[PDB]
């Protein structure tokens, strides 16, 4: 097969700038009638790739003009104009000269924006939780920036660090912050024999609630 | 809307699943259907094409013998069947097709969730997130359930902007995903709010009002 290389697993542009992503085939893929049948598509997450290069230079149906394409027989690059926070996601190129068709691996564009500092909120479980014999609860750090952050859960003043569960959200398509969602599960026993949560997330801002407080 | 694709299929290891992509409008004898595999946190990778008037077929050969297109030019939908499944068998799996005039447009169906795996469907519990006993965040719990995707809105898509809907996390061979909404703190209680979930797998929808906490 036509094996499609992008060297770079993502690119950082900082909004209003521009950006090339890079592609390469191991064949050429100008064909003699004169056309280079090189493609470009951006995937956005959780949903389906989007056309937006056709044939290495061609805009696709509703792409903007800030979108262009160019390349050699081997070498293509896409370039995206006064860069959009709407843009982040994986740019991918695929040839489509001869089958089987074949995708490159992949660019992630990252969005450069200024610190931002989480926005936290905890939560004690739900009571109709505590009837299935466990007990979740979930601290939420949302819309800071940069990617990494820390997360440490304290119970009646002692760190915990068994029982947690975290998971964090894509680059967001608005204002190019980033969220995570922190999750510590306990019996419905333990949760009851202790009084004291606590959620710190060091970038130190802490939340905390008492259980019989209500 | 042009391409229809169901949200998952749960099958055993070493059966074989039938995935279908029914197309709107007349000229489905007319394009090529094609058929594309992408790994959960991976890159794409095409399966093959058929083109539905002739049954046409052209195989990556990766996939021979696990692949099998198909058609029913009678209801206007294609077929792919995946056989003698493994777990590298599961992805998600999207049709797609180039528009009859116009090569600058291809529709993509919304993709198949396929889960190969020995356990069987749970539904989920959910569970609503009122704040401790400006601006008020209110949560959703959805708990314990398999296999993915759930899908998850606020007032039924009334609330989006303040929304933040994590990816799910495995334990213990169940699936758990939480959601945030942000909003005003006039909006709510005042306002009624509600998130709703839906898990096609077990066929179940729910709708759980966000209700402030009380001395119970």
């Known amino acids: 097969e036509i094996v499609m290389t992008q060297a770079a697993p993502s690119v950082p542009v900082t909004p209003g700038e521009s950006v090339s992503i890079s592609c390469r085939s191991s064949?050429?893929?100008?064909?003699?009638?004169?056309?280079?049948?090189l493609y470009w598509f951006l995937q956005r997450p959780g949903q389906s790739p989007q056309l937006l290069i056709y044939r290495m230079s061609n805009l696709a149906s509703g792409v903007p003009d800030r979108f262009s394409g160019s390349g050699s027989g081997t070498a293509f690059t896409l370039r995206i104009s006064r860069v959009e926070a709407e843009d982040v996601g994986v740019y991918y190129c695929?040839?489509?000269?001869?089958?089987?068709?074949?995708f490159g691996a992949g660019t992630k564009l990252e969005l450069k924006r200024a610190d931002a500092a989480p926005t936290v909120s905890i939560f004690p479980p739900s009571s109709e939780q505590l009837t299935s014999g466990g007990a979740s609860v979930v601290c939420f750090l949302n819309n800071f920036y940069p990617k990494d952050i820390n997360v440490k859960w304290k119970i009646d003043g002692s760190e915990r660090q068994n029982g947690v569960l975290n998971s964090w959200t894509d680059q967001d398509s608005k204002d190019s912050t980033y969220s995570m969602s922190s999750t510590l599960t306990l019996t419905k026993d333990e949760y009851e024999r202790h009084n004291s949560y606590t959620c710190e997330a060091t970038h130190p801002i802490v939340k905390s609630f008492n259980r019989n407080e209500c | 809307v042009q391409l229809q694709q169901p949200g998952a299929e749960l099958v055993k290891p070493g059966a074989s699943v039938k995935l279908s992509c029914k197309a709107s409008g007349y000229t489905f004898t007319s394009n090529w259907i094609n058929w594309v595999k992408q790994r959960p946190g991976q890159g794409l990778e095409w399966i093959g094409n058929?083109?539905?008037?002739?049954?046409?077929?052209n195989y990556n050969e990766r996939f021979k013998s696990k692949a099998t297109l198909t058609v029913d030019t009678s209801s206007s939908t294609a077929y792919m069947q995946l056989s003698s499944l493994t777990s590298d068998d599961s992805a998600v799996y999207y049709c797609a097709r180039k528009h009859y005039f116009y090569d600058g447009v291809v529709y993509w169906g919304q993709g198949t969730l396929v889960t190969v795996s020995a356990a069987k469907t749970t539904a989920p519990s959910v569970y609503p997130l009122a704040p401790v006993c400006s601006s008020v965040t209110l949560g959703c719990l959805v708990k314990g359930y398999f296999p993915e995707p759930v899908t998850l809105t606020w007032n039924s898509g009334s609330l989006s902007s303040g929304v933040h809907t994590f990816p799910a996390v495995l334990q213990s061979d169940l699936y758990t995903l939480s959601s945030s909404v942000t909003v005003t703190s006039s909006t709510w209680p005042s306002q009624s709010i509600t998130c709703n979930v839906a898990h096609p797998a077990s066929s179940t929808k729910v709708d759980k009002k966000i209700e402030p906490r009380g001395p119970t």
């Open positions: 058929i083109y539905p008037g002739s049954g046409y077929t």
């Open positions: 695929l040839q489509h000269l001869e089958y089987p068709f074949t």
């Open positions: 064949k050429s893929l100008l064909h003699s009638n004169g056309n280079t049948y």
